[PDB]
Design an enzyme around this catalytic site. Structure first.
Site, PDB file in Angstrom:
ATOM      1  CE1 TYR A 165       0.676  -0.977   4.544  1.00 52.84           C
ATOM      2  CE2 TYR A 165       0.849   1.387   4.340  1.00 52.84           C
ATOM      3  CZ  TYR A 165       1.078   0.237   5.053  1.00 52.84           C
ATOM      4  OH  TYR A 165       1.714   0.304   6.286  1.00 52.84           O
ATOM      5  CG  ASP A 197      -3.141   1.232  10.044  1.00 55.59           C
ATOM      6  OD1 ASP A 197      -3.626   1.398  11.161  1.00 55.59           O
ATOM      7  OD2 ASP A 197      -1.910   1.059   9.872  1.00 55.59           O
ATOM      8  CG  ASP A 220      -2.768  -3.156   4.683  1.00 57.36           C
ATOM      9  OD1 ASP A 220      -3.482  -2.273   5.184  1.00 57.36           O
ATOM     10  OD2 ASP A 220      -1.924  -3.784   5.342  1.00 57.36           O
ATOM     11  NE  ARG A 232       2.659   3.916   9.359  1.00 57.31           N
ATOM     12  CZ  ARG A 232       3.923   3.674   9.683  1.00 57.31           C
ATOM     13  NH1 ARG A 232       4.831   4.640   9.710  1.00 57.31           N
ATOM     14  NH2 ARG A 232       4.299   2.433   9.932  1.00 57.31           N
ATOM     15  CE1 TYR A 263      -3.564  -9.531  12.721  1.00 64.52           C
ATOM     16  CE2 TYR A 263      -3.559  -8.218  10.722  1.00 64.52           C
ATOM     17  CZ  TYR A 263      -2.878  -8.889  11.711  1.00 64.52           C
ATOM     18  OH  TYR A 263      -1.500  -8.912  11.681  1.00 64.52           O
ATOM     19  CD1 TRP A 292      -2.482   4.315   8.972  1.00 69.51           C
ATOM     20  CD2 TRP A 292      -2.259   5.255   6.951  1.00 69.51           C
ATOM     21  NE1 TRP A 292      -1.364   3.793   8.388  1.00 69.51           N
ATOM     22  CE2 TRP A 292      -1.195   4.363   7.158  1.00 69.51           C
ATOM     23  CE3 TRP A 292      -2.318   5.951   5.741  1.00 69.51           C
ATOM     24  CZ2 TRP A 292      -0.197   4.160   6.219  1.00 69.51           C
ATOM     25  CZ3 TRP A 292      -1.329   5.732   4.807  1.00 69.51           C
ATOM     26  CH2 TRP A 292      -0.287   4.841   5.047  1.00 69.51           C
ATOM     27  CG  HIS A 313      -6.730  -4.104   9.266  1.00 74.02           C
ATOM     28  ND1 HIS A 313      -6.801  -2.875   8.644  1.00 74.02           N
ATOM     29  CD2 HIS A 313      -5.425  -4.459   9.273  1.00 74.02           C
ATOM     30  CE1 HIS A 313      -5.584  -2.499   8.296  1.00 74.02           C
ATOM     31  NE2 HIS A 313      -4.734  -3.441   8.669  1.00 74.02           N
ATOM     32  CE  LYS A 314      -2.981  -6.996   6.939  1.00 74.86           C
ATOM     33  NZ  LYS A 314      -1.578  -7.458   6.938  1.00 74.86           N
TER      34      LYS A 314
END
Length: 360
Positions: free
Chosen positions: A24, A129, A74, A199, A122, A203, A118-119
């Site tokens: 990403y 993010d 991502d 960070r 996960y 995002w 998120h994934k």
């Protein structure tokens, strides 16, 4: 001195790696280089973008290093540069690649409140993010190709994320949330991770600015997202470092040994401030604050090399929660991750902030 071009030229000359996986942060850096193409009208920047993406985009539109069935949010971020390339060049392989990424959204798993996980690895987790990688890409895609009703899905994801991840005391948002509250890093009451990571907030504020920009002006949730952005900016300004005018890795713990001013989150925040003012989301009274913070990025994080090019320093290489290393989201954990120079997760936001500063 226009740092957007100087940094772009530095990235190209130093041959920073942007081609070793479907990352990403590589599309993010290219998105910054695309702004330099826009203002310079110099084809060498477009050519660099094309050549970089040629690693990934096969003539038939399949993407090297991408597997849809991993359901990794991502992996959507690099669709943004593909939109830019399709608009600029009209080449069909970019459109076919975009169709392939869009297909992930069809069945990408969602929380009980319809936010993308998120994934796949996960489950039940919302990380800040992901709002930039996923929902924001989806917004750009819908603007170009989609049906406008789909914006309702996107805005709902921002609203639910703020509801679940915001700290009422500071107004900051925690890095991640586990709806199932099963991860060891997750708070037994709230499901939240322990800290405000620079960070991660970066995002989310970039995601807001970039998503609001492509919303219909009359969209029912447009004002809500603008309010959330204002609230985030208020909260971030409370923890801005007074001396440097930038932000810490662990945002609210600046006095704690081990903490450090971190370049990628700081750049992302400055970009959002500048863009938010430009589009009217944030009040014009913030202009001098935004300018001063931008100059703080240069002061704290930029060093000239002997060839007259520049390095961007003090970038957190990677952070996350759980996974194979059972990352616990503690202060010690966030300080444990590498600090590096010339890392795309910082370079891209720095290019973007520079473009906005110059435009102002």
């Amino acid at each position: 001195q226009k740092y957007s071009k100087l940094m772009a030229d530095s990235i190209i000359a130093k041959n920073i790696t942007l081609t070793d996986h479907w990352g990403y942060e590589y599309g993010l850096t290219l998105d910054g280089i695309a702004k330099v193409y826009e203002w310079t009208k110099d084809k060498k920047y477009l050519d660099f973008i094309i050549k970089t993406m040629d690693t990934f985009i096969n003539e038939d539109g399949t993407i090297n290093g991408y597997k849809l069935e991993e359901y990794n949010i991502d992996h959507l971020n690099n669709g943004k540069i593909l939109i830019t390339l399709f608009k600029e060049t009209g080449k069909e392989k970019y459109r076919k690649a975009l169709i392939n990424l869009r297909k992930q959204i069809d069945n990408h798993p969602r929380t009980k409140e319809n936010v993308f996980w998120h994934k796949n690895i996960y489950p039940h987790q919302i990380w800040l993010d992901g709002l930039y990688m996923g929902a924001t890409f989806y917004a750009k895609y819908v603007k170009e190709f989609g049906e406008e009703k789909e914006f309702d899905d996107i805005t709902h994801q921002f609203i639910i994320t703020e509801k679940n991840l915001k700290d009422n005391k500071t107004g900051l948002l925690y890095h991640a949330y586990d709806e199932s509250k099963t991860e060891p890093w997750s708070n037994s009451e709230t499901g939240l991770s322990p800290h405000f990571w620079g960070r991660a907030m970066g995002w989310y504020v970039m995601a807001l600015a970039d998503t609001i920009e492509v919303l219909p002006k009359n969209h029912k949730d447009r004002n809500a997202l603008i309010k959330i952005l204002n609230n985030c900016v208020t909260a971030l300004l409370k923890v801005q470092d007074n001396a440097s005018k930038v932000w810490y890795q662990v945002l609210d713990e600046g006095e704690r040994k081990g903490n450090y001013l971190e370049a990628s989150g700081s750049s992302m925040i400055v970009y959002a401030l500048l863009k938010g003012v430009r589009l009217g989301y944030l009040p014009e009274s913030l202009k001098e604050t935004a300018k001063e913070a931008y100059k703080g990025l240069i002061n704290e994080f930029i060093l000239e090399t002997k060839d007259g090019l520049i390095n961007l320093n003090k970038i957190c290489y990677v952070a996350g929660l759980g996974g194979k290393d059972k990352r616990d989201g503690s202060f010690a954990y966030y300080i444990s991750e590498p600090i590096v120079s010339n890392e795309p997760k910082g370079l891209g936001p720095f290019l973007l902030a520079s473009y906005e500063y110059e435009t102002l």
